[PDB]
Amino acid sequence: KVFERCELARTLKRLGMDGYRGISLANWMCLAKWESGYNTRATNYNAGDRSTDYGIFQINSRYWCNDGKTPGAVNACHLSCSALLQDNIADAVACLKRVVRDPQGIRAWVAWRNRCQNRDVRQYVQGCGV
Numbered sequence: 649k650v651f652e653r654c655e656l657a658r659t660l661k662r663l664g665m666d667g668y669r670g671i672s673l674a675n676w677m678c679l680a681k682w683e684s685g686y687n688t689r690a691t692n693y694n695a696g697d698r699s700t701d702y703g704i705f706q707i708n709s710r711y712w713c714n715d716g717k718t719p720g721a722v723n724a725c726h727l728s729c730s731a732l733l734q735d736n737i738a739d740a741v742a743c744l745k746r747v748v749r750d751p752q753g754i755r756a757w758v759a760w761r762n763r764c765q766n767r768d769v770r771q772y773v774q775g776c777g778v
């Protein structure tokens with residue numbers, strides 16, 4: 649499903665996203681916007697290493713989830729990539745929390761790096777009452 653901006657903001661806040669590991673909700677909002685357009689069914693196949701990015705947060709199948717088709721997969725989230733394609737994003741949020749705990753943190757998300765890092769992201773949560 650495709651979340652409406654404020655609907656997503658409220659869901660993430662409710663799931664403990666606001667300030668997680670020091671990262672703001674607006675930053676998470678910007679990340680989701682540019683990674684998937686708030687679409688939980690979004691998938692991106694990377695011909696290079698044969699890995700795929702899954703869900704609203706576009707989490708990669710080589711290091712975080714298992715899709716059974718990616719070489720050298722690590723499955724750090726100990727979760728099937730299918731759970732990252734659900735309308736209910738609780739599983740995705742739990743894996744995202746694991747992803748960010750690694751050394752490079754939020755820099756793990758290229759779209760966030762390109763369109764959010766070092767920029768003003770206050771607009772993504774404006775008028776959402778979060």
Ligand SMILES: CC(=O)N[C@@H]1[C@@H](O)[C@H](O[C@@H]2O[C@H](CO)[C@@H](O[C@@H]3O[C@H](CO)[C@@H](O)[C@H](O)[C@H]3NC(C)=O)[C@H](O)[C@H]2NC(C)=O)[C@@H](CO)O[C@H]1O
Pocket residue numbers: 701705706707708709710711712722747750751752756757
């Ligand atoms: C959200 C998402 O799935 N993003 C993907 C990126 O996370 C991914 O980058 C790679 O992540 C792994 C795991 O964090 C990096 O290896 C970790 O790096 C630390 C410190 O360097 C090391 O101590 C860990 O052992 C190591 N993990 C393992 C299991 O080896 C890896 O270096 C990251 N790659 C790069 C190029 O920075 C990228 C690329 O795979 O894809 C995103 O979709």
